[PDB]
Amino acid sequence: LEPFYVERYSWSQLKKLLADTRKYHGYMMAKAPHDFMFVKRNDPDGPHSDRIYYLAMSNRENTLFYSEIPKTINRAAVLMLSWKPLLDLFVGIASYDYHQGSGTFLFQAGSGIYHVKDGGPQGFTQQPLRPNLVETSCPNIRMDPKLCPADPDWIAFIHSNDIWISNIVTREERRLTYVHNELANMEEDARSAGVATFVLQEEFDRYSGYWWCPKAETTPSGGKILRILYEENDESEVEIIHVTDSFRYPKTGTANPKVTFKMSEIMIDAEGRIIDVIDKELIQPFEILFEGVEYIARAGWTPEGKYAWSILLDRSQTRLQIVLISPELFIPVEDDVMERQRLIESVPDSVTPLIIYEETTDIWINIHDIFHVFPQSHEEEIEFIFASECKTGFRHLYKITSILKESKYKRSSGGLPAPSDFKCPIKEEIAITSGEWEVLGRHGSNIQVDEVRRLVYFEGTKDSPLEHHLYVVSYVNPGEVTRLTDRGYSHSCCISQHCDFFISKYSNQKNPHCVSLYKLSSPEDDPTCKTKEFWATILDSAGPLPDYTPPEIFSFESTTGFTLYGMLYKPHDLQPGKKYPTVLFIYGGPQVQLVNNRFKGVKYFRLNTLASLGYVVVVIDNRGSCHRGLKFEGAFKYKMGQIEIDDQVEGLQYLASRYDFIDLDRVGIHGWSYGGYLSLMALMQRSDIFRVAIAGAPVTLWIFYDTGYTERYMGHPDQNEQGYYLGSVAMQAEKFPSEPNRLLLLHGFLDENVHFAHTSILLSFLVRAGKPYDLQIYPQERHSIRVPESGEHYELHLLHYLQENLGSRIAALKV
Amino acid sequence: LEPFYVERYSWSQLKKLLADTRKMMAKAPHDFMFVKRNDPDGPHSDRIYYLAMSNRENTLFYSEIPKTINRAAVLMLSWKPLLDLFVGIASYDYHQGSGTFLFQAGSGIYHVKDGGPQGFTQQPLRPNLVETSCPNIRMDPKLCPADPDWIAFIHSNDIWISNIVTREERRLTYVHNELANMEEDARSAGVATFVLQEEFDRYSGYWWCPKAETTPSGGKILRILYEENDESEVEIIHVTDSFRYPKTGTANPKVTFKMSEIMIDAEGRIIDVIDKELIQPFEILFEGVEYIARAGWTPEGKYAWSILLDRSQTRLQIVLISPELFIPVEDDVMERQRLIESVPDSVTPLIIYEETTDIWINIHDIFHVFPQSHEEEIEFIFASECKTGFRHLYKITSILKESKYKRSSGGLPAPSDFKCPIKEEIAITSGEWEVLGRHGSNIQVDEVRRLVYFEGTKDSPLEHHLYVVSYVNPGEVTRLTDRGYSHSCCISQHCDFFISKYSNQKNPHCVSLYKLSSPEDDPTCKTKEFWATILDSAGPLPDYTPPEIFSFESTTGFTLYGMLYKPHDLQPGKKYPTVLFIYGGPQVQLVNNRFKGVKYFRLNTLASLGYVVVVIDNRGSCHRGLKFEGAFKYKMGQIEIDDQVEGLQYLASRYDFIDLDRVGIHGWSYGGYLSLMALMQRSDIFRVAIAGAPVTLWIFYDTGYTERYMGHPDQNEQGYYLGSVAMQAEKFPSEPNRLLLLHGFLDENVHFAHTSILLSFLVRAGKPYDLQIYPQVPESGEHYELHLLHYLQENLGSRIAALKV
């Protein structure tokens, strides 16, 4: 079998070749319609059932569109919905709030907060609407604006890490919290109000830190009380890091912010003006009420506003509690310590945190966005749907009834609560779903509960670990699960709040993403049984790209007892009796799955380019990758970096003994982030297999990464001395090759997740160890390769590097 | 004519070749001082004290100079340690009258006594810590010449004084607070700021008045002149803490002179300190003046002096400043208004010297002031390039006229209002060669025989020599050091001995003592006699082949010198890959008759491998006069590479072993710059450029350096553009393996900023580059030399290098 050698292009040729095949994209394309809302027309004589509002790009601003849903279609034809701009514009909108009662939209668009009215009592527009600025006196950019659901004249926003409110009719503006000072330096002033800190945004996808009570409590006076639950964070003890401003980064094994809950009680007169603002604090400290809690993972309100709820995690992230928090647990902030004593005694001992759910695992808690509270029908019971892996090892929906009874803990006795004094008994716990597959609850995946038909819609892997599908099941007598989406695609969906329509954004390997609307119905005889009919296209496919050759999906029966899936890009113009150089592309880390039946043409296009130059490309989902349950994810607990390259090599050898065109003496490996890490691990542990590793923004030292990620997967470094040692490439610089042109590092200097520090400390230990390395730095742009200028130079340098040191004739003659 | 191909070594083999051949060096005796023994009966004339490294502490030694020698033998002086030790001393202070030494060593300021009226020790002395309550490091300690019980030092950027007999300690300035950060508080007293340390080699910012004035009571007044500096307006920059860096075209600090008047009773205790300030702000008195380049006192402390430069560094002034120009710092403007009006209007600054150039002023350490023979005259020696374009000694008499201008007339002074009439201005030296005044080079003045000893390039621009000349009837210049060595000397304060440290290409550095004599008939004539060795040459290094010095007449009208390292085991009919080593910037000369086997040892290693190493001092380099230096004014980056190429063609048409198709270029700092400029401008000549810590963008560099050679940026947008490689990324090649950048992350004057910004623009332009970073040392240097040899082999030298293209 004769080696194939990639045509040795020049840097000028390779630049032009890249510039010609990039007639589209910048690692992403126009954002597909998203954040759908369904509003009923309610016109007996009109042709349209519903108006749908969404965000999309028509290089254009992300903004708000609507489309008309007709009552009936030509079932012969295909209706392409037309996009009607909602807004007049003379940046972008990333999200929006809506109040159905009033038809009020609220959204940030650059520095400005705007509002417009559509779909309420005032009716439906046939023309773009003028966004109305919410006038402010605040000097700095306002962030994270939200309508009071109890009263849509009122909004809240954040300004210099404090919570403010503003009335969009009266223009009254009022600061609620006094915890931060913009003029003091972030070394001195490290307290915030209503803002998710770094680890909760980066490692748990919680972006908001305050929650409006959805109901107003009327006064005797004809006024009302509006309420805001908010987290308050003291980041003083937290490590600072400087990146050519500063910021607060809890490094593994170091302090997370000090956290509590607070309650702002806002009194309004009959005319809608502020009488008073009372800031309120927990009757006892957070550490006393919620013992062992590190992380406030999610929070909000019960539907009637009777309770705040939170999902609370311990530091090890192996204990999850759901807790109800009555607003009566909060008392005014009071400086007079006798007056404060009187406020403490004034609240009954019967008023206590209510742990309505608690679970533990020896692997990890994966936080998700699934939690639905049914209307209370009795004061002593709450009924809710939650999702959990902790019962069977696959994430399933459970319908739970918890009993809300008095604690044995009486605060009057002057003692401190015992570890389970707030545990609620479970009256009932029922599995709504089960089996060797998972319900999705992350990255837009959620449930829609139909409380009239007693159904829940959910997305899952039931049909295949390689496609997300939409499903419905009864939550009252769980039996039959109906798949609502069609096989041969992966679906990302949402359901109308009215439960008579669903939208799917779907793709496969051959076919770019499309977005289509589906009507839902019931056979006249059984409202429980659900059928779908096609209604309309929102976004048409481009169809198979004229140049792009999709990969093939393969699987192998691993010795570890799991099926492993992979993608294979056969080289273009394959020849008999020639074996081609192989690039393995890897992520390999938790919470990600590369191999599924979706279009890889937008973001992984250049794996096709590589194939067009004469490289075999391989991608494998090693143990630890997601959508295969907690046991499969749990393989590397404490052992990150130890098992991943085994699976990669096993799959590569599987492919090699099946296809003689794979040249095992010319394997390169390339990844970003966790994939950068495994590229380094691969060259270090298996220099026999891998000729070259290109490591992009690698983790090189687990103690330099953050609390929320590394402790979930690796525990505390005191309890895993060898895991941290073996897992940390920088601690093992002496195991790298002593021959150059095998190791290439790539990093941006201003990277905010994986710091340049990882590359720079690796470089220090490579230098002390007398080891060669190549380096490409993207000096600015923070996103480094996401920004096209840095990205095109990366693609270019990468293609040349593989040509010079793996692919070409010269490369062979260099060794 | 066949190509030669360097052996292709593995990484591991190059590391071995490098560790085997490897095996700064110990610092040679320096900071010499001669003390007479005055013992008619004893065998010694003088004790000398000096600092030296015996991998040891730099510390204080003495040796004994005998009254006679055995002329048949060679005397090696023995090094006797002055200090009883079980960090380093960088410098020391001494007071002849008391025999008191003062030196910092680490955290501690210390003192001992020797050679005073207590006499000479025969055994090491215990250093005496000056006790302090100051929480932080004390800096820059100095004996009060008037009273050796009194020292000064800097703590948290204020001037303190302390008494080594009484234990009395006192803060003199309250200009900075340490519990407050540095973005708020940018005020310092007695401390030279970043640009004067780095660009003018001024390290102290306060100066003891050398005489004490008596108080009627039997007490006295000590004085300290000092610069006060406000860096508020000056730009801040950070590296992985932060500092005040005057970027070119932006704010230099606000500067004044201040005077601390210290009052002591008969028993040596402080009665009071009055801080005093200029009677009219610095800008009023010192029109046009950006930098305080140098300051000090006349020998009897009547006037303070300063050498003042304008921002463009083309106007130099020497100024006498009477302590009578300073008045107490007063809150209440009523009480203030008498102090102002009382000071006579006759008391004015006296500009005793002024000069101007269309190139630039080179600041130096030569300034000697004679005793005041007459109240209306000052007599001094200064050195200047400003007449002939070569640095020469001048004897000047300036008349100290009452100024035309009056301060009671509520007026503002005109420019020439403080100028002093030049009575007399006699050239002591002249010719197409320069007196040296920088980096230790200075004069010693013999006031009894009316002689001045000085160092110069009279004999060759390749060798520094010691010379002596009369300053009264300047005539014959006598060279005192021997041809075939470059010398760095100091002269005894008694003008009867000198010490030379000298080396040449073959011979590592050596330090010898020479007795000076006069024949009885003519005290004015000088002879020298070898007296003793202080530091023996290592002897020739046993596997170092020195380079040869070549020259060439050049189309620019100047002789240009270079070093040529021939390939070892040279073969006939084989042309060899060529490496150009370069600095090329101002204030440096690489090419001279000195030992190169310590710093440039690896030039010889490159030659051993089969490379032709070449070094060339282009126009802009030093020791060749101001016109030669001036060739690149406004034009840095534009002319240097012509000279390098010219010299390479010269060698190529004279020697056929030079393969012009395989030329590499390598330098650091300004050398890194010219390395990029060379691949940018002349890719036809240079296959590969290896730039270490390069300047890539002149707006990124500081005031004191870049505005001297390139002007304010506003009036040279074109020169700043054409000399900034970061503003010209598109001109680099579009094949890789030709451009290698090396930079320390934590680099202090050539910030990584230069490298990242060039990378940022290389990426914009879709151009390839190799990079090595050294994030925090011998380990780094080892890796660089290995990475360098490997890079040259793989991309210039070897067989595979020529296949690759």
Ligand SMILES: *C(=O)C(CC)(CC)C(=O)Nc1cc(C(=O)OC)cc(C(=O)N2CCN(Cc3ccc(Br)cc3)CC2)c1
């Ligand atoms: C790791 O997870 C990091 C590395 C920068 C940082 C935490 C990361 O976020 N990677 C990453 C992020 C985005 C993004 O969309 O940010 C908003 C995009 C990309 C990305 O586009 N890449 C780089 C290129 N990879 C495919 C590829 C292979 C070969 C060739 Br020649 C070109 C392109 C896809 C991942 C990364």
Ligand SMILES: *C(=O)C(CC)(CC)C(=O)Nc1cc(C(=O)OC)cc(C(=O)N2CCN(Cc3ccc(Br)cc3)CC2)c1
């Ligand atoms: C430039 O002027 C800078 C760059 C770091 C300052 C910004 C500089 O100071 N250069 C420089 C300074 C010293 C020094 O005196 O520090 C105590 C030393 C050196 C130095 O290391 N070099 C560079 C290597 N040189 C020749 C060489 C050629 C080939 C090989 Br394989 C090895 C060595 C000797 C001097 C730089």
